[model samples]
Target: RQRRLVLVIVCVALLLDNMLYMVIVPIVPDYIAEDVKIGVLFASKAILQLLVNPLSGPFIDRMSYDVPLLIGLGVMFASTVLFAFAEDYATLFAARSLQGLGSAFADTSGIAMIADKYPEEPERSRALGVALAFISFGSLVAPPFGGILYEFAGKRVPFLVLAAVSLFDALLLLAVAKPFSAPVGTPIHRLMLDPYIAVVAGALTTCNIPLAFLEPTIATWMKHTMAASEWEMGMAWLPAFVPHVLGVYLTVRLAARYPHLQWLYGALGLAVIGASSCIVPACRSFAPLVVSLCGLCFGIALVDTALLPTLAFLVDVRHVSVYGSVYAIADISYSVAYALGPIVAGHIVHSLGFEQLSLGMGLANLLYAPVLLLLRNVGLLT
Candidate 1:
């Protein structure tokens, strides 16, 4: 209802969803022996979320924004509760499924609610930017915090605390979300037909492949190859997350000077360089690895902030009905990218080693570049 309250609900819900997704980032590799298997599990949440995401935007539009939003929070609450006491794989898997659905709801609805509250010129632009940063904010704390929380407080603590916090926020939104109404959207089929939307799907998916590729092995690699502990693995990602957070502040300034696609081309180059650095056996220390990760994070953060708006702008031309499908395409791309990255990387890691896998996936970031380059050529920068 109120802007402040809406902001709080959206922010906390984001934190809860992101924190839940990434908590396993530091330690899941230890539990599963095969990196591919771990990737599959890691991908499960996204897989489910991917299924829901395309439908969620339109659902929020056709129904009330809060409907899926509350549903998502409810599912997440259940997911965290299960996670708090989870003892085996099945429970964890089921929890991930719930998380995926919940994330879709929260994402589609929360942003819509925020947009509703602040639709005026200066406030509108600023509010959206803040929301975008908020999207990244949870990621800021998730990795290391998950590590520390799990290490000191134990795994149960992370889930229990998130569960409590999210429940309060979820219920509050559920009670108060009624003041918001559905915004219009585009039809699903026409959205699928758009070549530009297809490119958006392809580029977004491929860009994320390298990042997810590391997830299954990073923790395990740190443990066996680098003599790091679970917490240390978590500590290692601390450096990577900073540049991503820091990059957000400079995006506007950076865009003003550089060719927009140049940012992506540069980011791809940095990603390749960063991933290559990680493959070097001598780059065993977390410090060196952090250096490598910095390049990748800076590039990713830059690209993320830039491309996030591009997709929104592209979708704005069509009906809000198409919004769900637009986001769905984006969702499916990365989820599938993450899904495919691990399966492929797992085998690569198993067959050769983490080195080759890192090398290959790092290069793979280039695969998506052509798609964007094409868009750039067509003057589809927006």
Candidate 2:
């Protein structure tokens, strides 16, 4: 019961953290493009993340989880507050960079904390499910809420809300949990040596690459190509959450019934199907777009929910922090892909156009199947 309570608290913190992080996605492009180059703004955050995460991961492994968690929360809170007051792109970029650093700290520590509390096999999977569900729920809410916030209060309000949430979460973590012990004698290099870690990292990177692209790409396409208003785009984005929510529920049951291999293959099939649906020559209306988004959501959700638990199984309790560090390293790919996606899509749309880029993304999803199989063969999937 105590463990469950702890899990709930952690889940809530993650919910707020992710909500804050994602709220920026729908708004940032417009905000920055109005003042500076969108590519530079996005790249600045990614660059900071890449540099900070590698250091922060080892720091989390070396130090207590509580230290990083509190510091991360503080940094994010401060950054958001600054963002609310910023009048220029430079200030916004600085705020985002700080926010990235804070996020890296909070995310690594949160995963470490989960790895600490639920180290056993059966419990670990369930705990991961709970955590991922909260994250998905937060992702679901952020877009619409951000839309509303942008509509009513302007761009600054979301950051202000995020600042409040971060402070609140920090207090909750400090009050509820003690600092977790560092995992002893685990070298950073060894984390990479684990075949499972590599596979998990690769799979996550592949899954996130498309997502990073799709978030802005699809929104832009809906707006420009389909003539979707902000509200309509928000509505289109809403359907993506359905399969994700359903997939989370399905993952819990699926993980219980079959081994991780089944989950991997099932997830891959869903990914291919989902991606292919959008590869059609043209989407004349919103219905097909929503269907394609749902498919993508289902596939990615299955992959994500199953991926972390399987990675957790590879480490003992003592080394979960290091394992988490390794997981954090995987996220570097996500950040890079995110920073690059819009820029690349922008170029591609300028040169080859949206249909070609859409096809390319779909093809990219298809390409992951072989990589998934390779991962399975390498003992990462099982």
Q: Candidate 2 lDDT (Cα, whole model)? A: 0.68
Residue 310 of model 1 has an lDDT of 53
Candidate 2 per-residue C-alpha lDDT over 131-218 given as tens digits, one digit per residue, 9 for 90 to 100 = 8878888877566877686779786666677778778777876777766534463555677776546656766676766566665656
lDDT string, candidate 1, 59-107, tens digits: 6666546566777788778888987677577777787777777776667
Please tell me which predicted candidate would have the highest lDDT against the true structure. 2
Q: Which ten residues in a row are the worst by lDDT in model 1?
A: 317-326
TM agreement with the true structure for every prediction: 0.81, 0.87
TM-score, cand. 2 vs. native: 0.87
lDDT of 1 at 240: 65
The prediction achieving the highest TM-score against the true structure is 2
Please, what is the whole-model Cα lDDT of each candidate in the order they appear? 0.63, 0.68
